[PDB]
Amino acid sequence: RMKQLEDKIEELLSKNYHLENEVARLKKLV
Amino acid sequence: RMKQLEDKIEELLSKNYHLENEVARLKKLVGER
């Protein structure tokens, strides 16, 4: 379960980075 | 250690939702989706 939590942290971190990229992409449009 | 990992998930998930909310607002402004 330790490994599952670790994988989810890595997964969420990647998702957050994507969303941060998206914010930047969307800002640039503006 | 479980507690630490779980706290990290709850932290990142909250950050995720705040970013999603912002992306949603910006998409509307620029008239994306």
Curated annotation (Swiss-Prot), chain B:
In residue numbers, the region (Leucine-zipper) covers: 5-26
Compartmental location: Nucleus
Q: Which residues form a coiled coil?
A: none
Instruction: Specify the domain of life of the species encoding this protein.
Output: Eukaryota
The consequence of inactivating this gene is: Abolishes recruitment of the mediator complex to the upstream activating sequence (UAS) of amino-acid starvation responsive genes. Decreases RNA level of genes involved in amino acid biosynthesis and cofactor biosynthesis during amino acid starvation or methyl methanesulfonate stress. Growth dependent on amino acid supplementation. Sensitive to amino acid starvation. Sensitive to purine starvation. Decreases cellular glycogen levels during glucose starvation.
Disulfide cross-links? none
| Residues annotated as signal peptide | none
Q: What does the entry say induces or represses the expression of this protein?
A: Translation is induced by amino acid or purine starvation, or during growth in low or poor carbon sources. Translational repression during nutrient-rich conditions is dependent on four uORFs (upstream open reading frames) present in the 5'-UTR of the mRNA; these promote ribosome dissociation. Translational induction occurs in conditions reducing translation machinery efficiency, leading to ribosomes scanning over the uORFs, and increased translation of the mRNA. The rapid translational induction is followed by transcriptional induction at later time-points, independently of the uORF sequences.
Posttranslational modification: Phosphorylated by the cyclin-CDK PCL5-PHO85.
Q: What does this protein do?
A: Master transcriptional regulator that mediates the response to amino acid starvation. Binds variations of the DNA sequence 5'-ATGA[CG]TCAT-3' in canonical nucleosome-depleted 5'-positioned promoters, and also within coding sequences and 3' non-coding regions. During nutrient starvation (low or poor amino acid, carbon or purine sources), it activates genes required for amino acid biosynthesis and transport, autophagy, cofactor biosynthesis and transport, mitochondrial transport, and additional downstream transcription factors.
Family note: Belongs to the bZIP family. GCN4 subfamily.
Entry note about domains: Residues 89 to 100 and 106 to 125 define the N-terminal activation domain (NTAD) and the central acidic activation domain (CAAD) respectively, which can function independently to promote high-level transcription of the target genes.
UniProt subunit comment: Homodimer. Each subunit binds overlapping and non-identical half-sites that flank the central CG base-pair in the pseudo-palindromic motif 5'-ATGA[CG]TCAT-3'. Interacts with the mediator tail; the interaction with GAL11/MED15 is direct. Interacts with the SAGA histone acetyltransferase complex. Interacts with the SWI/SNF chromatin remodeling complex.
Name this protein carries in UniProt? General control transcription factor GCN4
Protein's organism = Saccharomyces cerevisiae (strain ATCC 204508 / S288c)
